[PDB]
């Protein structure tokens, strides 16, 4: 009635593909600031998908 | 030289030497000194030392030769000096 598993399958990808970005230890400073402002794209995009 | 100066002074230096590593659980792993401490020399500027910064667990080998093999396949390089 209100599930849509194809939309949820993508949600799982975004979930596990987030940790790869939220783990990559960067040797810089602003390149660590771009590591944070990437979730405002990683999560926004997943909502647009549903 | 005071046989008391260098004994206290050498300590002051040796104290302040720290080399990146990962604490392991498996009893069959030996830390790779030689190449690992080489990276701490330049300053992690060089890629063979910039590779050990990101994932320091690349220095935990269980079998000689296999230690170096990994620091080649993950570089495309043919020889470190």
């Amino acid at each position: 009635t209100v599930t849509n598993e194809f939309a949820s399958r993508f949600r799982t990808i975004v979930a596990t593909l987030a940790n790869v970005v939220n783990e990559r230890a960067v040797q810089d400073d602003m390149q660590k600031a771009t590591r944070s402002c990437t979730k405002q794209w990683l999560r926004h995009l997943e909502t647009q998908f549903d | 030289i005071p046989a008391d100066e260098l004994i206290d002074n050498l300590h002051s230096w040796m104290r302040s030497v720290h080399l990146l590593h990962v604490r392991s659980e498996d009893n069959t792993l030996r830390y790779n000194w030689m190449l690992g401490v080489y990276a701490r020399s330049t300053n992690y500027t060089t890629p063979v030392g910039q590779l050990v910064v990101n994932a320091p667990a690349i220095l935990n080998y269980s079998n000689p030769q296999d230690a170096f093999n990994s620091v080649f396949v993950a570089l495309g390089i043919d020889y470190i000096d």
Binding site: S8, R43, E46, T47 | -
Partner: protein, 49 residues
Amino acid sequence: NIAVAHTDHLSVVYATMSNFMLNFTNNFSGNHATFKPDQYVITSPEGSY
């Protein structure tokens, strides 16, 4: 000369503040060596938080 007012007047207008409504968090600052604030994420079964 500022020491007088900054101690027994600009200190009463603070002790009042912490009692107001709409103010509900602890911004404790004594001891910088070990203080981190609290994360309060709104989680959901599906989707993101």
